[PDB]
Amino acid sequence: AIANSSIAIDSTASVTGGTARTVKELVRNNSELNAYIDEGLSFQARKEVAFSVKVPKVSVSAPGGFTQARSTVILKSPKTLANGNRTVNTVSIQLSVDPETTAAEVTTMLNAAAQLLFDSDYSDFWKAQALA
Amino acid sequence: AIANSSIAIDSTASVTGGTARTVKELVRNNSELNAYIDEGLSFQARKEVAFSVKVPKVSVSAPGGFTQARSTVILKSPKTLANGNRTVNTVSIQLSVDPETTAAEVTTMLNAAAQLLFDSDYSDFWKAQALA
Amino acid sequence: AIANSSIAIDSTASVTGGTARTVKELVRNNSELNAYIDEGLSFQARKEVAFSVKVPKVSVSAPGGFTQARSTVILKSPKTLANGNRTVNTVSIQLSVDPETTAAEVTTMLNAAAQLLFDSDYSDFWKAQALA
Amino acid sequence: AIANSSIAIDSTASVTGGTARTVKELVRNNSELNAYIDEGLSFQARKEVAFSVKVPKVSVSAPGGFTQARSTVILKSPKTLANGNRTVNTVSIQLSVDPETTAAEVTTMLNAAAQLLFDSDYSDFWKAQALA
Amino acid sequence: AIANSSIAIDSTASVTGGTARTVKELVRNNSELNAYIDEGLSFQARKEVAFSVKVPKVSVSAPGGFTQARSTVILKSPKTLANGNRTVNTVSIQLSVDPETTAAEVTTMLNAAAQLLFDSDYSDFWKAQALA
Amino acid sequence: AIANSSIAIDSTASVTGGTARTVKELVRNNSELNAYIDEGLSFQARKEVAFSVKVPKVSVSAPGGFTQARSTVILKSPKTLANGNRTVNTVSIQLSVDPETTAAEVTTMLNAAAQLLFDSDYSDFWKAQALA
């Protein structure tokens, strides 16, 4: 259903229901912030999420003088299989903007990308792996 | 920010306001879709979200037996600089689950990851690039 | 200027007027803090003061026995030029005392150094680069 | 105390109390001016301060054509240890500005850097070497 | 003494002596956290307590799946001897516990372990090394 | 948490939870004392705490005359895991302090160290290894 879909641009996103958890910080080091979501689960099945930041550096290429500012979030979800082996399902979110980018342009990018992974038109692409 | 933030697990995410754009496919093949968000803009200033897919491959030495079902989305965003040059800002979202994962465990991961895109708690992390 | 100038040793330095900004931490680790003075500016035009630290290392062939306690601060300041390029002006302050130094001696040193930053006598030296 | 601190930007700094000394100039050569603060002390315990200037030169890199203009001040504080060996405690202040920088932009930098080493919060960073 | 000493298991440990100091962190380095207790002492005579973690790593050995989660706390209390030189008196504590263990057991173990070091029975053991 | 945690120096540590068990010694071997807490558990499920002393030895090095007097306590709490096997969760404590130390400072150190392990700020550090 990635075809004539629909997405609201420059819109406010909200969340209703669910169970409010808490992101507990574990270690901040090496431009990385390791944390975990507290759902009252065991250590082997947590919801660890890692926040990392890559600050821009001066360059000669990169038309504007500096490399892009990258911000990456990886959410880890341990899954237990039928046999009993443990696997981790991950979602990575990486945002690379030029340092000249305004906060309103980043907000538009953030909100449009949020609906890209919760709008119903993309359900089969994420779950069924269906391009059309 | 990233420290004591709350995320509503297994909630419903919606959108209000904004302008409804259609998204129109440009090019296909192979296991790779290319589209663009139509908002009445020029050819160089259009959004252009891309959709990639990596099907589960039958491995041997892996949990479950197969490799993971990778599904990537990249939203591009052209921006013109103070020197007149042209660059692109991107948001890359990769979902990597095992094929044994159910749709409901995937709908939870997407909703959790979508919240760390638009939740007000993680704003200084994306725009100010402030880990804490 | 630098010739017959007067510096008030062991005085009290204060500030009047101006706008009170908060300074916000960006990134930590390791023995290196990074912050930014928040004055409602864009990401490329923010102050961004950084804090470094070198702890006293126990040497052998040194006065007192250990190496010196180094403490560095670098205030950055973005500036755009007449050709549209971006550069950074910096102020670097390094304090290097022996571990046996008392707090009042460090207070005196910091007061003298601060005086040799804002005293009207040393204005041509910083801006006009006039040695005398 | 480098966290939610406070600094006045574009403010006037003043000094009260203390004992007005005099900076007597010793040697002015090689883009350097050696001087000493006169407190009626011995030669082995003076408050020697060195002023150095590094003028910009033409370049092809350095986006604006010139290297930065640097002004350095080193204040030396002889300390006598318990055993009896003599060490020197130094404070370096290096200001590097692009030559296009206005005098108001330099004044703002100087005033912010002044409070960076006399505000009561950073007292823990300079003496205790405490990042937070 | 040690023999026939009584320990109250699963007990709340209070404390009432006053002199509420503050643990201020200094550096972080590699998966560590070096802090110090702010009591107003000298710079090289303060009590620095260091924290460290050694999060479990998935092994093939370790009958239970993988290594334990050890947490260390070293409290360094410096001392000036009569002869004149300096020495540090340290108190290290480690918590090598299997990651599957619950938080109630850890609280039980922490209380039982901390029930030593202030119980009157062990006073001579900690001070005079009176084993028997 | 660890940052800005308060510890009350020179404090009386009480305990009120009940369940007054008894430490019964088992063996002595070489300058050691292996005991166990009598809670009615099984033979290989009881908690054994081992005490050991390492009295000073007159050296030529050791700036203070001779090595420190160390006292170790290891609390071994056994645990049966879900997989079925058995493991031990241990809490070791050491007091390597210089023999010239008075008993008052040793008591201060023991109170400060035992003020950890039951303080609320360090709960997350001991349980989830939440350094930051």
Side-chain angles (χ1 to χ4, degrees), chain B residues 26-65:
Chain B
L26 294 161
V27 179
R28 195 174 292 259
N29 209 240
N30 31 67
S31 78
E32 207 296 355
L33 207 147
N34 221 297
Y36 79 89
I37 294 131
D38 173 49
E39 31 193 308
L41 296 182
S42 88
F43 179 87
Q44 197 164 42
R46 69 212 191 135
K47 246 46 182 148
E48 256 182 55
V49 49
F51 289 79
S52 171
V53 137
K54 204 150 298 163
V55 297
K57 162 166 100 103
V58 183
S59 91
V60 160
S61 47

mmCIF file of all heavy atoms in Angstrom, chain B residues 26-65:
data_model
loop_
_atom_site.group_PDB
_atom_site.id
_atom_site.type_symbol
_atom_site.label_atom_id
_atom_site.label_comp_id
_atom_site.label_asym_id
_atom_site.label_seq_id
_atom_site.Cartn_x
_atom_site.Cartn_y
_atom_site.Cartn_z
ATOM 1 N N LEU B 26 7.889 6.544 -7.752
ATOM 2 C CA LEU B 26 8.694 6.914 -8.911
ATOM 3 C C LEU B 26 9.186 5.694 -9.683
ATOM 4 O O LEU B 26 8.820 5.493 -10.844
ATOM 5 C CB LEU B 26 9.890 7.765 -8.470
ATOM 6 C CG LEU B 26 9.599 9.139 -7.881
ATOM 7 C CD1 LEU B 26 10.793 9.636 -7.097
ATOM 8 C CD2 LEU B 26 9.263 10.096 -8.997
ATOM 9 N N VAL B 27 10.001 4.861 -9.039
ATOM 10 C CA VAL B 27 10.714 3.776 -9.695
ATOM 11 C C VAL B 27 10.653 2.552 -8.791
ATOM 12 O O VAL B 27 10.586 2.656 -7.566
ATOM 13 C CB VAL B 27 12.177 4.159 -10.021
ATOM 14 C CG1 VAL B 27 12.922 3.016 -10.690
ATOM 15 C CG2 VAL B 27 12.220 5.391 -10.913
ATOM 16 N N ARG B 28 10.669 1.381 -9.416
ATOM 17 C CA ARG B 28 10.572 0.118 -8.706
ATOM 18 C C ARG B 28 11.734 -0.762 -9.160
ATOM 19 O O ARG B 28 12.556 -0.345 -9.982
ATOM 20 C CB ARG B 28 9.187 -0.489 -8.957
ATOM 21 C CG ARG B 28 8.795 -1.605 -8.034
ATOM 22 C CD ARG B 28 7.360 -2.008 -8.282
ATOM 23 N NE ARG B 28 6.416 -0.969 -7.891
ATOM 24 C CZ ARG B 28 5.721 -0.985 -6.764
ATOM 25 N NH1 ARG B 28 5.887 -1.942 -5.867
ATOM 26 N NH2 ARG B 28 4.844 -0.015 -6.526
ATOM 27 N N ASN B 29 11.824 -1.965 -8.586
ATOM 28 C CA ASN B 29 12.834 -2.971 -8.913
ATOM 29 C C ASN B 29 14.199 -2.609 -8.347
ATOM 30 O O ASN B 29 14.665 -1.476 -8.504
ATOM 31 C CB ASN B 29 12.951 -3.180 -10.427
ATOM 32 C CG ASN B 29 13.386 -4.585 -10.795
ATOM 33 O OD1 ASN B 29 14.419 -4.778 -11.434
ATOM 34 N ND2 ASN B 29 12.588 -5.568 -10.419
ATOM 35 N N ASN B 30 14.843 -3.564 -7.685
ATOM 36 C CA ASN B 30 14.241 -4.847 -7.341
ATOM 37 C C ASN B 30 14.308 -5.026 -5.836
ATOM 38 O O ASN B 30 15.367 -4.853 -5.237
ATOM 39 C CB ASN B 30 14.943 -6.000 -8.054
ATOM 40 C CG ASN B 30 16.413 -5.737 -8.290
ATOM 41 O OD1 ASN B 30 17.204 -5.668 -7.350
ATOM 42 N ND2 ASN B 30 16.791 -5.602 -9.553
ATOM 43 N N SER B 31 13.173 -5.372 -5.230
ATOM 44 C CA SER B 31 13.032 -5.364 -3.777
ATOM 45 C C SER B 31 13.391 -3.986 -3.227
ATOM 46 O O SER B 31 14.025 -3.843 -2.180
ATOM 47 C CB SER B 31 13.874 -6.466 -3.130
ATOM 48 O OG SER B 31 15.240 -6.105 -3.076
ATOM 49 N N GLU B 32 12.964 -2.958 -3.961
ATOM 50 C CA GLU B 32 13.326 -1.580 -3.669
ATOM 51 C C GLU B 32 12.295 -0.656 -4.304
ATOM 52 O O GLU B 32 12.193 -0.583 -5.531
ATOM 53 C CB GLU B 32 14.747 -1.303 -4.183
ATOM 54 C CG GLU B 32 15.562 -0.200 -3.480
ATOM 55 C CD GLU B 32 15.007 1.215 -3.595
ATOM 56 O OE1 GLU B 32 14.015 1.444 -4.309
ATOM 57 O OE2 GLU B 32 15.627 2.128 -3.011
ATOM 58 N N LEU B 33 11.517 0.041 -3.482
ATOM 59 C CA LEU B 33 10.569 1.015 -4.003
ATOM 60 C C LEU B 33 11.108 2.428 -3.820
ATOM 61 O O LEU B 33 11.838 2.722 -2.871
ATOM 62 C CB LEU B 33 9.221 0.874 -3.300
ATOM 63 C CG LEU B 33 7.969 1.311 -4.060
ATOM 64 C CD1 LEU B 33 6.802 0.431 -3.676
ATOM 65 C CD2 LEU B 33 7.639 2.761 -3.780
ATOM 66 N N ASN B 34 10.747 3.308 -4.749
ATOM 67 C CA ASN B 34 11.085 4.721 -4.661
ATOM 68 C C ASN B 34 9.823 5.533 -4.893
ATOM 69 O O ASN B 34 9.107 5.305 -5.872
ATOM 70 C CB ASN B 34 12.162 5.103 -5.675
ATOM 71 C CG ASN B 34 13.192 6.049 -5.101
ATOM 72 O OD1 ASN B 34 12.874 7.174 -4.713
ATOM 73 N ND2 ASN B 34 14.440 5.596 -5.039
ATOM 74 N N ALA B 35 9.550 6.469 -3.994
ATOM 75 C CA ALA B 35 8.357 7.290 -4.080
ATOM 76 C C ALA B 35 8.748 8.725 -3.760
ATOM 77 O O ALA B 35 9.919 9.031 -3.523
ATOM 78 C CB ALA B 35 7.263 6.763 -3.145
ATOM 79 N N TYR B 36 7.761 9.613 -3.760
ATOM 80 C CA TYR B 36 7.996 10.997 -3.382
ATOM 81 C C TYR B 36 6.703 11.573 -2.835
ATOM 82 O O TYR B 36 5.620 11.252 -3.324
ATOM 83 C CB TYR B 36 8.520 11.828 -4.565
ATOM 84 C CG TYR B 36 7.476 12.277 -5.567
ATOM 85 C CD1 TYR B 36 6.797 13.479 -5.413
ATOM 86 C CD2 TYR B 36 7.181 11.503 -6.677
ATOM 87 C CE1 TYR B 36 5.852 13.888 -6.335
ATOM 88 C CE2 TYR B 36 6.243 11.903 -7.602
ATOM 89 C CZ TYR B 36 5.580 13.093 -7.428
ATOM 90 O OH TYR B 36 4.641 13.482 -8.355
ATOM 91 N N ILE B 37 6.827 12.418 -1.817
ATOM 92 C CA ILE B 37 5.669 13.056 -1.202
ATOM 93 C C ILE B 37 5.314 14.286 -2.028
ATOM 94 O O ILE B 37 6.085 15.246 -2.095
ATOM 95 C CB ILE B 37 5.940 13.420 0.261
ATOM 96 C CG1 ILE B 37 6.116 12.154 1.097
ATOM 97 C CG2 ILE B 37 4.822 14.270 0.815
ATOM 98 C CD1 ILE B 37 7.326 12.155 1.969
ATOM 99 N N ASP B 38 4.142 14.259 -2.656
ATOM 100 C CA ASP B 38 3.723 15.329 -3.556
ATOM 101 C C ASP B 38 3.081 16.451 -2.753
ATOM 102 O O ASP B 38 1.978 16.293 -2.222
ATOM 103 C CB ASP B 38 2.755 14.784 -4.601
ATOM 104 C CG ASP B 38 2.149 15.878 -5.466
ATOM 105 O OD1 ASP B 38 2.911 16.721 -5.984
ATOM 106 O OD2 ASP B 38 0.912 15.897 -5.627
ATOM 107 N N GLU B 39 3.766 17.590 -2.672
ATOM 108 C CA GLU B 39 3.259 18.766 -1.978
ATOM 109 C C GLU B 39 3.360 20.004 -2.860
ATOM 110 O O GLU B 39 3.542 21.117 -2.361
ATOM 111 C CB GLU B 39 3.999 18.984 -0.660
ATOM 112 C CG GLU B 39 5.439 18.521 -0.677
ATOM 113 C CD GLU B 39 6.041 18.449 0.709
ATOM 114 O OE1 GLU B 39 5.965 19.452 1.445
ATOM 115 O OE2 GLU B 39 6.591 17.387 1.064
ATOM 116 N N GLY B 40 3.251 19.820 -4.172
ATOM 117 C CA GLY B 40 3.333 20.934 -5.102
ATOM 118 C C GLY B 40 4.669 21.643 -5.098
ATOM 119 O O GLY B 40 4.715 22.878 -5.156
ATOM 120 N N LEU B 41 5.761 20.892 -5.029
ATOM 121 C CA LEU B 41 7.096 21.462 -5.014
ATOM 122 C C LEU B 41 7.831 21.092 -6.299
ATOM 123 O O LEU B 41 7.381 20.249 -7.080
ATOM 124 C CB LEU B 41 7.857 20.996 -3.772
ATOM 125 C CG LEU B 41 7.297 21.447 -2.422
ATOM 126 C CD1 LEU B 41 8.176 20.954 -1.284
ATOM 127 C CD2 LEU B 41 7.143 22.957 -2.378
ATOM 128 N N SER B 42 8.980 21.722 -6.510
ATOM 129 C CA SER B 42 9.762 21.491 -7.711
ATOM 130 C C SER B 42 10.463 20.136 -7.645
ATOM 131 O O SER B 42 10.414 19.424 -6.641
ATOM 132 C CB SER B 42 10.783 22.608 -7.905
ATOM 133 O OG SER B 42 11.994 22.314 -7.233
ATOM 134 N N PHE B 43 11.131 19.789 -8.745
ATOM 135 C CA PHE B 43 11.794 18.495 -8.844
ATOM 136 C C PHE B 43 12.964 18.378 -7.877
ATOM 137 O O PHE B 43 13.219 17.293 -7.345
ATOM 138 C CB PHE B 43 12.265 18.262 -10.280
ATOM 139 C CG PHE B 43 12.993 16.966 -10.478
ATOM 140 C CD1 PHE B 43 12.296 15.809 -10.765
ATOM 141 C CD2 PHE B 43 14.370 16.903 -10.375
ATOM 142 C CE1 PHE B 43 12.958 14.619 -10.946
ATOM 143 C CE2 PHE B 43 15.035 15.715 -10.555
ATOM 144 C CZ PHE B 43 14.329 14.571 -10.839
ATOM 145 N N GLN B 44 13.695 19.463 -7.648
ATOM 146 C CA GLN B 44 14.856 19.409 -6.772
ATOM 147 C C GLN B 44 14.501 19.576 -5.300
ATOM 148 O O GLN B 44 15.344 19.304 -4.440
ATOM 149 C CB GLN B 44 15.874 20.479 -7.182
ATOM 150 C CG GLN B 44 17.264 20.256 -6.618
ATOM 151 C CD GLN B 44 18.327 21.079 -7.313
ATOM 152 O OE1 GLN B 44 18.118 22.252 -7.615
ATOM 153 N NE2 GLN B 44 19.483 20.470 -7.560
ATOM 154 N N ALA B 45 13.277 19.990 -4.986
ATOM 155 C CA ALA B 45 12.891 20.309 -3.619
ATOM 156 C C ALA B 45 11.817 19.367 -3.090
ATOM 157 O O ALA B 45 11.142 19.681 -2.110
ATOM 158 C CB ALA B 45 12.423 21.759 -3.524
ATOM 159 N N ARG B 46 11.644 18.210 -3.720
ATOM 160 C CA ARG B 46 10.623 17.263 -3.297
ATOM 161 C C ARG B 46 11.193 16.272 -2.288
ATOM 162 O O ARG B 46 12.401 16.035 -2.232
ATOM 163 C CB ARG B 46 10.046 16.514 -4.498
ATOM 164 C CG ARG B 46 11.017 15.549 -5.134
ATOM 165 C CD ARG B 46 10.780 15.434 -6.616
ATOM 166 N NE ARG B 46 11.536 14.333 -7.197
ATOM 167 C CZ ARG B 46 11.035 13.458 -8.054
ATOM 168 N NH1 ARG B 46 9.778 13.530 -8.457
ATOM 169 N NH2 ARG B 46 11.815 12.488 -8.520
ATOM 170 N N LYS B 47 10.296 15.677 -1.501
ATOM 171 C CA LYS B 47 10.656 14.841 -0.360
ATOM 172 C C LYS B 47 11.375 13.549 -0.745
ATOM 173 O O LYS B 47 12.511 13.333 -0.319
ATOM 174 C CB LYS B 47 9.402 14.519 0.445
ATOM 175 C CG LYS B 47 9.361 15.116 1.844
ATOM 176 C CD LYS B 47 9.775 16.577 1.884
ATOM 177 C CE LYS B 47 9.757 17.090 3.319
ATOM 178 N NZ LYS B 47 10.776 18.140 3.586
ATOM 179 N N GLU B 48 10.739 12.694 -1.551
ATOM 180 C CA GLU B 48 11.358 11.460 -2.042
ATOM 181 C C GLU B 48 11.736 10.427 -0.982
ATOM 182 O O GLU B 48 12.921 10.231 -0.705
ATOM 183 C CB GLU B 48 12.610 11.783 -2.860
ATOM 184 C CG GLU B 48 12.427 11.662 -4.351
ATOM 185 C CD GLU B 48 13.701 11.952 -5.100
ATOM 186 O OE1 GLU B 48 14.720 11.293 -4.810
ATOM 187 O OE2 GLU B 48 13.688 12.841 -5.975
ATOM 188 N N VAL B 49 10.751 9.771 -0.376
ATOM 189 C CA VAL B 49 10.984 8.662 0.549
ATOM 190 C C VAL B 49 11.240 7.384 -0.251
ATOM 191 O O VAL B 49 10.582 7.137 -1.268
ATOM 192 C CB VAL B 49 9.797 8.486 1.510
ATOM 193 C CG1 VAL B 49 8.495 8.470 0.739
ATOM 194 C CG2 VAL B 49 9.947 7.222 2.334
ATOM 195 N N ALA B 50 12.195 6.572 0.204
ATOM 196 C CA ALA B 50 12.525 5.298 -0.427
ATOM 197 C C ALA B 50 12.209 4.122 0.495
ATOM 198 O O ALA B 50 12.250 4.240 1.722
ATOM 199 C CB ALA B 50 14.000 5.255 -0.819
ATOM 200 N N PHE B 51 11.899 2.975 -0.113
ATOM 201 C CA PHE B 51 11.487 1.775 0.608
ATOM 202 C C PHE B 51 12.297 0.576 0.139
ATOM 203 O O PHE B 51 12.116 0.110 -0.988
ATOM 204 C CB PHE B 51 10.006 1.483 0.391
ATOM 205 C CG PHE B 51 9.088 2.437 1.079
ATOM 206 C CD1 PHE B 51 8.838 3.686 0.543
ATOM 207 C CD2 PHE B 51 8.457 2.078 2.252
ATOM 208 C CE1 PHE B 51 7.984 4.559 1.172
ATOM 209 C CE2 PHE B 51 7.604 2.947 2.884
ATOM 210 C CZ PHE B 51 7.365 4.190 2.343
ATOM 211 N N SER B 52 13.154 0.055 1.009
ATOM 212 C CA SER B 52 13.969 -1.112 0.707
ATOM 213 C C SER B 52 13.467 -2.313 1.499
ATOM 214 O O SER B 52 12.735 -2.176 2.481
ATOM 215 C CB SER B 52 15.446 -0.846 1.018
ATOM 216 O OG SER B 52 16.213 -2.031 0.916
ATOM 217 N N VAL B 53 13.868 -3.507 1.059
ATOM 218 C CA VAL B 53 13.441 -4.747 1.699
ATOM 219 C C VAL B 53 14.507 -5.819 1.515
ATOM 220 O O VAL B 53 15.099 -5.945 0.438
ATOM 221 C CB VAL B 53 12.079 -5.211 1.146
ATOM 222 C CG1 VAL B 53 12.065 -6.707 0.884
ATOM 223 C CG2 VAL B 53 10.967 -4.825 2.095
ATOM 224 N N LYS B 54 14.773 -6.582 2.571
ATOM 225 C CA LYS B 54 15.693 -7.717 2.533
ATOM 226 C C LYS B 54 14.946 -8.926 3.083
ATOM 227 O O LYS B 54 14.664 -8.996 4.283
ATOM 228 C CB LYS B 54 16.954 -7.427 3.332
ATOM 229 C CG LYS B 54 18.158 -8.230 2.907
ATOM 230 C CD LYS B 54 19.436 -7.457 3.169
ATOM 231 C CE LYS B 54 19.477 -6.165 2.369
ATOM 232 N NZ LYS B 54 20.492 -5.216 2.903
ATOM 233 N N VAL B 55 14.633 -9.876 2.206
ATOM 234 C CA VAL B 55 13.785 -11.009 2.592
ATOM 235 C C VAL B 55 14.562 -11.934 3.518
ATOM 236 O O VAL B 55 15.809 -11.952 3.473
ATOM 237 C CB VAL B 55 13.293 -11.760 1.345
ATOM 238 C CG1 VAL B 55 12.421 -10.854 0.502
ATOM 239 C CG2 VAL B 55 14.470 -12.274 0.537
ATOM 240 N N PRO B 56 13.901 -12.703 4.384
ATOM 241 C CA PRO B 56 14.632 -13.646 5.245
ATOM 242 C C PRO B 56 15.309 -14.727 4.420
ATOM 243 O O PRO B 56 14.685 -15.382 3.583
ATOM 244 C CB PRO B 56 13.536 -14.225 6.147
ATOM 245 C CG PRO B 56 12.412 -13.277 6.054
ATOM 246 C CD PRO B 56 12.462 -12.700 4.680
ATOM 247 N N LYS B 57 16.598 -14.911 4.669
ATOM 248 C CA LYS B 57 17.411 -15.867 3.931
ATOM 249 C C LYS B 57 17.655 -17.096 4.794
ATOM 250 O O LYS B 57 17.912 -16.976 5.995
ATOM 251 C CB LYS B 57 18.732 -15.216 3.520
ATOM 252 C CG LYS B 57 19.838 -16.170 3.127
ATOM 253 C CD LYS B 57 20.951 -15.413 2.435
ATOM 254 C CE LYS B 57 22.101 -15.135 3.387
ATOM 255 N NZ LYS B 57 23.252 -16.048 3.166
ATOM 256 N N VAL B 58 17.573 -18.275 4.184
ATOM 257 C CA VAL B 58 17.725 -19.521 4.926
ATOM 258 C C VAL B 58 19.196 -19.731 5.256
ATOM 259 O O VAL B 58 19.970 -20.215 4.423
ATOM 260 C CB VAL B 58 17.164 -20.718 4.134
ATOM 261 C CG1 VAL B 58 17.268 -21.996 4.952
ATOM 262 C CG2 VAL B 58 15.731 -20.458 3.717
ATOM 263 N N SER B 59 19.589 -19.367 6.474
ATOM 264 C CA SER B 59 20.936 -19.636 6.960
ATOM 265 C C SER B 59 20.956 -20.962 7.710
ATOM 266 O O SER B 59 20.004 -21.743 7.620
ATOM 267 C CB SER B 59 21.426 -18.502 7.858
ATOM 268 O OG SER B 59 21.096 -18.756 9.208
ATOM 269 N N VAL B 60 22.040 -21.237 8.434
ATOM 270 C CA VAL B 60 22.137 -22.464 9.216
ATOM 271 C C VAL B 60 22.438 -22.130 10.671
ATOM 272 O O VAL B 60 21.727 -22.568 11.581
ATOM 273 C CB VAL B 60 23.204 -23.409 8.634
ATOM 274 C CG1 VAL B 60 23.659 -24.413 9.684
ATOM 275 C CG2 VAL B 60 22.660 -24.118 7.407
ATOM 276 N N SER B 61 23.493 -21.352 10.899
ATOM 277 C CA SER B 61 23.964 -21.062 12.252
ATOM 278 C C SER B 61 23.358 -19.751 12.750
ATOM 279 O O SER B 61 24.049 -18.777 13.049
ATOM 280 C CB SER B 61 25.488 -21.021 12.279
ATOM 281 O OG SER B 61 25.990 -20.238 11.211
ATOM 282 N N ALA B 62 22.028 -19.745 12.838
ATOM 283 C CA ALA B 62 21.311 -18.578 13.316
ATOM 284 C C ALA B 62 20.152 -19.022 14.193
ATOM 285 O O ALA B 62 19.663 -20.149 14.035
ATOM 286 C CB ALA B 62 20.786 -17.722 12.161
ATOM 287 N N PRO B 63 19.707 -18.182 15.123
ATOM 288 C CA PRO B 63 18.485 -18.497 15.869
ATOM 289 C C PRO B 63 17.305 -18.673 14.926
ATOM 290 O O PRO B 63 17.100 -17.883 14.001
ATOM 291 C CB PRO B 63 18.309 -17.278 16.777
ATOM 292 C CG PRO B 63 19.672 -16.725 16.928
ATOM 293 C CD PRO B 63 20.354 -16.956 15.619
ATOM 294 N N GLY B 64 16.521 -19.720 15.164
ATOM 295 C CA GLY B 64 15.364 -19.984 14.334
ATOM 296 C C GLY B 64 15.707 -20.731 13.063
ATOM 297 O O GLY B 64 14.938 -21.580 12.605
ATOM 298 N N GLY B 65 16.864 -20.418 12.486
ATOM 299 C CA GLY B 65 17.317 -21.074 11.278
ATOM 300 C C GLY B 65 17.598 -20.116 10.140
ATOM 301 O O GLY B 65 18.575 -20.291 9.409
#
